[PDB]
Design a binder for this molecule. Structure first.
Ligand SMILES: Cc1cccc(C)c1NC(=O)Cn1nc(Cc2ccccc2)c2ccccc2c1=O
Ligand SMILES: Cc1cccc(C)c1NC(=O)Cn1nc(Cc2ccccc2)c2ccccc2c1=O
Ligand SMILES: Cc1cccc(C)c1NC(=O)Cn1nc(Cc2ccccc2)c2ccccc2c1=O
Ligand SMILES: Cc1cccc(C)c1NC(=O)Cn1nc(Cc2ccccc2)c2ccccc2c1=O
Ligand SMILES: Cc1cccc(C)c1NC(=O)Cn1nc(Cc2ccccc2)c2ccccc2c1=O
Lengths: 79, 79, 79, 79, 79, 85, 85, 85, 85, 85
């Protein structure tokens, strides 16, 4: 018996109005806003990596070892 | 017996109005907004990687090792 | 016996109005908005990768190792 | 028997209005806002990594060793 | 029997209005705001790593040893 | 006078506008004007008497949602001698 | 005067507009004007009497959703002598 | 006079605008104007009497949501001799 | 006079604007104007009597949400002799 | 006079603006104007009598949320002889 990340709700009544609710959020990206106004961007790239935009990554994994959620704007030359 | 990421709701009544609800969110990307107004972008690329737009990635995996959710704007020259 | 990512709801009554509901979201991309107004973009590419648009990827996998959800704007020259 | 990250709520009444709710947030990125107005950016890159945009990463993993959530703007040349 | 990071709420009444709620936040990034106005940035990079944008990373892991949540703007040349 | 020109190029765009007026636009947005949501009423034994003589009476469980642009929204109006010249 | 020109190019676009006025546009949007959602009523033993003499009475469980552009929305209106000249 | 020019380039954009006026825009936004949400009422034994003579009465459990642009929103209005010249 | 020029380049942008006026914009925002949220009422044995003669009475459990732009929002108004010239 | 120039470059941007006026903008913001939140009322045995003669009475459990732009918000107004010339 083991509980992990469990939302539990219980209610009891006889007469009237009863409301029961449960919510669970795991690995959730919520509410990302970006505004660019009159922005000047000049990029010169020679064999590299340049990142300018908006990146939103949400990952949920079970029994996963060595997982990478996001890898943005990198140069890898492993031998 | 094992519980993981479980939303549970229970309700009981005799007379009236009863509401029971349960929600679960795993690896969810919600609410991404981007606005660009009068933006100037000049890009010169020679053999590289340039990223300017909007990227939204949501991944849910079970029993997956070494998984990568997002890999944006990279140069890889492994030997 | 094992529960993972399970939404459960139960309700009981005798007289009146009863509502029971359950929702589950796994690997879901929701609500992506992008607006570009009077935007100038000049791109010169020679053998590279340039990404400017909007990308929304949602992936759900079971028993999958090494899976990649999104790989946007990259140059790969592995030997 | 073991409880970890569990939200529990219980309520009881006879007559009236009763509200029961439970919420759980694990590895959640919420409320990221970015505004750039009249911003000038000039980037010259030769074999490197340059990151300018907005990155929001949320990762939840169970039984995962060595996992990396985000790796942004790096140069790796391991031998 | 072991409790860790558990939010518990209980209420009882006979007549009237009763409210019971429980919330849990683990590894949550909330409320990040950034504004740049009339900002001039000139970057020249030769084989290095330069980071200028906004990064928000939230990671929750169970039974994970050696995990790294964020690694931003680094040069690694391990032998 | 508004003049835009582009000469001796490979890719060229020349746009000139005298007067411009933008409008309203909605992208991925939700709106709620005059919305009644989630009303629950429980009554066991209610004794009610109404005696109306030339009036406006609104009685019982009432849920009204209204949205008017160039008009008035009323629930109970007992008036008289309404004229427009 | 508005002039736009493009000469000696390979790909060229020249657009000139004197006066421009944008309009309204909806993209992936939801709207709710005058909406009644989720009304639940439970009554066991209700005794009700109504005596109406020249009036407007709204009685019982009532759910009204209205949307008017160039008119008035009313639920109960007991008026008299309405004239327009 | 507004002049924009671009000569002897490979990629060139020349835009000139005399007068410009931006508008309203919504991107991923939610709006709530005149919204009634989450009303719960429990009554066991209510004795109620109403005697109305030429008036406006609003009685019982009432949930009203209104949104007017160029009009007035009223719940109970007992007036008389309304004229417009 | 407003002049913008760009000559002898590889990538060039030239924009000139005489007069500019920005507008309102919402990005990932929530708004609540005239919102009633979370009202709970419990009554066991209420005895209530109303005697109305040419007036406006608002009675019982009432939840009103209003939003007006160019109009007035009233709940109970007992007036007389309203004229506009 | 406003002049912006850029010559003999590889990447060049030249922007000139005579008069500029920014506007309002919301990014990831929440607003609450005229909001009633979390009202709970419990009554056991209430005896109430109302005698109204040409007046405005607001009675009982009342929750009112109002938002007006170019109008007045009133709850109970017993006036007379309202004229506009
Ligand atoms: C709702 C209600 C109930 C009972 C008592 C009243 C006063 C009201 N309020 C109104 O009628 C508001 N109104 N008035 C006028 C003008 C007018 C009214 C009556 C007769 C002649 C002219 C009007 C004209 C054109 C389109 C809309 C409207 C409008 O909406
Ligand atoms: C709804 C209601 C019930 C009972 C009492 C009243 C006063 C109202 N309110 C209104 O009739 C509002 N109204 N008035 C007028 C003007 C008019 C009304 C009656 C007779 C002659 C002219 C009107 C004209 C054209 C299109 C719409 C409308 C409109 O909508
Ligand atoms: C709601 C209500 C109930 C009972 C008593 C009253 C005074 C009100 N309030 C109003 O009628 C407000 N109003 N008035 C006028 C002008 C007018 C009214 C009546 C007769 C002739 C002209 C009007 C004209 C055109 C479109 C809207 C409206 C409007 O909305
Ligand atoms: C709400 C209410 C109830 C009972 C008593 C009163 C005074 C009010 N208040 C108002 O009617 C406010 N008002 N007045 C006028 C002007 C006008 C009113 C009546 C007759 C002729 C002209 C008006 C005109 C056009 C569109 C809106 C309106 C408006 O909204
Ligand atoms: C709310 C209320 C209840 C009972 C008593 C009163 C005085 C008020 N207050 C107001 O009516 C405020 N008001 N007045 C006027 C002007 C006017 C009013 C009546 C008749 C003729 C002209 C008005 C005109 C146009 C649009 C809005 C309005 C407005 O909102």
């Amino acid at each position: 018996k083991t509980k992990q990340g469990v939302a539990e709700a219980a209610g009891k009544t006889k007469e009237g109005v009863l409301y029961v609710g449960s919510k669970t959020k795991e690995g959730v990206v919520h509410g990302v806003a970006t505004v660019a106004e009159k922005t000047k961007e000049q990029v010169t790239n020679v064999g590299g990596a340049v990142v300018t935009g908006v990146t939103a990554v949400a990952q949920k994994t079970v029994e996963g070892a060595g997982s990478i959620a996001a890898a943005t704007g990198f140069v890898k030359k492993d031998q």
